[PDB]
Amino acid sequence: DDTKTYILSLPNYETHTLDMGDQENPDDSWSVSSEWGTTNYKYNLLTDASGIFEFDCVSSTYGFYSDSFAFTNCTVEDCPDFASYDYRAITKKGVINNTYVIVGAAGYKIGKNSDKEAAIRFRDHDNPNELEDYRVKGLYVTNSVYAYSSMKEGTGYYGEEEIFGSNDSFKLTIYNYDKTMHVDCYLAEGTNLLDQWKWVDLTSLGETKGLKFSLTSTKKNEYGPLTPTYFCLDGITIED
Template sequence: MKKLSLFFLSLMCITLWSCSDDENPAIEVVVNFSDKLTDPNSSFQPEGGEVDGYYKVVTFTDTRNLVEMPSYYSDWGFGGGFTYTNISDKTTPGYMNLGNITGVGRSGSVYLTANSNAYTPAYVKNLDVSKYQFKGAWVTNSTYAYLAVKDGNDGNNPALVRKFGDGDWFKLTAVGYDVSDNELGCVDFYLADYRDGQSKVVNAWEWFDWSALATADHISFELSSTDSGEFGMNTPSYFCMDGITLVEK
């Protein structure tokens, strides 16, 4: 009987130990912009801002003020950084189309479109690093970049942008920085990959894991491509993002 009691006591301890990790699961928070736009096929229309080169620049936040990001714009519209939109156009080439190739958002009707380069950098800043860490986000190709890569059609200069072939790639890199702008590391995501016999151009929402950059104060985004020339990358420096996810510490 004593041996039996010890057995059940041991079993109970094992059960309690195995469940202990589930008692306080990490709480995830998904950033969204669902209440920011009311009209269909529309985008963020910034006002004010400071002049930065050819553009004015403002920063905006999500519905719950969890993250902040920049938006560059001019009289003709979006110039770079990030904007939020619900455009569903999957077929029109060119930079005026801010839609993504899926035609819909991943976690709602409103999602983010970015144009990130040296002149209009796109970044996401964690507004409460004492409470939250970065986990990741869903990404996909913009219609603009997708048609340029897949068909060689950027809606502007077919002699400049070429259709991707063997060995080509189009890569999104997330770079994490601390509050003092010291680099913490980086992670890559291929928006198009024609290496090693592949011919993939992302046309669905796919998860981009930022766990290696979890403690970053802000994450910036860089784009690179094998289709580059004397003046830089020929592939449009656009991508789309949705469902930025934070985890409570």
């Protein structure tokens, strides 16, 4: 047999970083103005150390964007990076080492014209300049401190009615690239909030060149979920 298996391999960072790609020289940037303000955005296509995995990373005036991916090993309780919103893993490290991926999946689009969806994509081992369909074995997910804490203690913007009771749940849906297949997973069921790394089998997605993500909470108001739609992932394992 010569089926090859490829596992996400994140960079090892000098000290404690939130990596949203180069901010001085981003791949792209733009501004949006509305009646409520003008906001500046920067976009970088992040890649892992192996060159197999790529991730869409939007950042803005206000930090990590709502539909974006970034890498971190920030364990230091005080990066000012997480002063406002603690996107770090509740597990405090990755599955196999200290770096993991933070993910925003609020459901807004990215790109100057809001027409692109934030995604992870897979490249050919022999040519990083071509996407390739793989069988996705799965990946590990866990909660962010930000979301865990909202569901446990109402520490977010809306306060006390964020707190999960036994009717509640927080569901991650993982899609294939064109979204014709998905797998559902729970980050929280009732008052049981995931605080470990959890493997999600994604083999039922079939061959695909990438992954997209959605979040649903039972705590919501008219405009969206009260639960922050940030989580973490690691260990994406694909096979050709």
